[PDB]
């Protein structure tokens, strides 16, 4: 008829009529985690809900690790900027003069500019990617545990109710036996003091049957409460996982855009050097130099 | 005395000053402004203008060397950057993220390696097209100038020698003149028979000394003219060399600029695949992938009995 596994009742075996999915054909949490998972390695049994929770937790661990990756990237960029900046301060070939000297100086200064660009890049990574990836929903900690214990407690109630039901089944079958006995005693010899006990047996028996019906009802109520809770919570988990994926995609797109625009900014720093390289004139340089270093403008002549 | 001699080279006195026009009277050329020696701003020492030109050449070579080394530093930096980027690209952080999100993440990591390739290639091209050409330009120039130095220097030595002779000759002249001018006095006070022949000897040797002077002056002027023409051609050569130096340096710095540009373009192009996969991320499909593998069963509970 039906079957009970871990205090929960399912159809049996069956090739039964029914059953349409709750959300076709999304692979929803609310449709595929009713049975409990028996680990095949022999470490106990857990509700499917536990699988959902572990999946969520793992998701958060993942976004943490991503954040860490970005932190490492930031560190690399800072070292790069550091080196570029120090090299920009280098005094190599500083005594080169003229428009050539100007262009060279501008090359070094351009190095400084690149360094600043990459530093700001790393800062933007920090504010707009690393911290958001990390600091996303810090408060899942005991909250999700709370949810867990909630569902678990509902399962507790279910188990209790099942126990009560089984007890009722015992009492019922027992009383039935007692009545079917005492009616045989009425078949052998009433009497009249024996008879009202035969009536009382019927009383207590039917009473026990009503007790059974009651216990079964309360069981079904417990399972239905557990059911509705299961549904709402699992859908909540589905939504949360989806939006996790969404925010991560968003911030990775952020990373890509920052990379792109940072490389544009970086490329734009050699243009000043280019402007000066075009203005380089060997003749003008030479004349400037001769103007500052001449020994005199008189030519030799013959003696006497 | 209408000329003046400083450091064995003869210039007008000035006067006042004559005039004389420049060889290249619109340019501030090497051939017009480095005949005189530069006076030490303190002592009684001088150095030739030509030496100033030579020193300028040497400085030029030193400077292209230093630029080359600067580029070496840049190469080292880029290489360290590339190394770090490569190692981080190999990191296994969040490797257990699965589905299209996991794949997009994987490409995020790989793009770092791609950047590494770009920057490494950048540094390599810096080495090939910028550093080495700067360093290896005119390798024997150090000695090519040294030889050049000796050339002009040797001429100047000769000039000095000639000048010395001239001065020596003047000594001999002034002496002989006096020797004559003072033997006529001996005849003026106590004339005798040997003194006349001593005046004859004196006059002879005197005119001879004068002829020696004239000759020495001629050879001096000859030496100075040789020094002059050679000086001119050589200074024009150094002018040309400095020009071609500046031009090659400009060329290779432009090369540097080009490498910068294309390196930043290549670098920018590495996030495009990441973008492409990032657009393909689907939460629903991901979920389907996971649930298909982790479902416990799709049968719902029912009522007892």
Numbering used by the authors:
A (entry chain B): 172 to 475
B (entry chain A): 171 to 475
Excerpt from the publication:
The asymmetric unit of the F-BAR domain crystal contained two F-BAR dimers. These dimers interacted with their symmetry-related dimers, forming filamentous oligomers with asymmetric flat surfaces, which we refer to as flat filamentous oligomers (FFOs). The FFOs had a width of ~14 nm with a ~5 nm distance between adjacent F-BAR dimers, while the F-BAR dimers were ~22 nm in length. The lateral alignment of F-BAR domains in FFO appeared to be similar to the pitch of the GAS7 striations on the monolayered membrane. The FFOs of the F-BAR domain in the crystals appeared to be mediated by two GAS7-specific loops, filament forming loop 1 (FFL1)  (aa 171–197; GAS7cb amino-acid residue numbers) and filament forming loop 2 (FFL2) (aa 206–219), which are located on the convex and concave surfaces, respectively. Due to asymmetry, one side of the flat surfaces of the FFO is more positively charged than the other. Thus, we supposed that this surface could be the membrane-binding surface. One of the two FFL2s lacks contacts with the adjacent dimer and protrudes from the FFO surface, suggesting the direct contact of the FFL2 with the membrane.
In this study, we show that GAS7 plays a critical role in phagocytic cup formation in macrophages. Crystallographic, electron microscopic, biochemical and cellular localization analyses revealed that the GAS7 F-BAR domain possesses unique hydrophilic loops that contribute to two-dimensional sheet formation of GAS7 on flat membranes of phagocytotic cup, indicating that the sheet-like assembly of GAS7 is essential for phagocytosis. The structures of the F-BAR domains in both crystals were almost identical, with a root mean square deviation of 1.2 Å. The GAS7 F-BAR domain forms a helical-bundle dimer with a shallow concave curvature, which is one of the flattest curvatures amongst the known F-BAR domains.
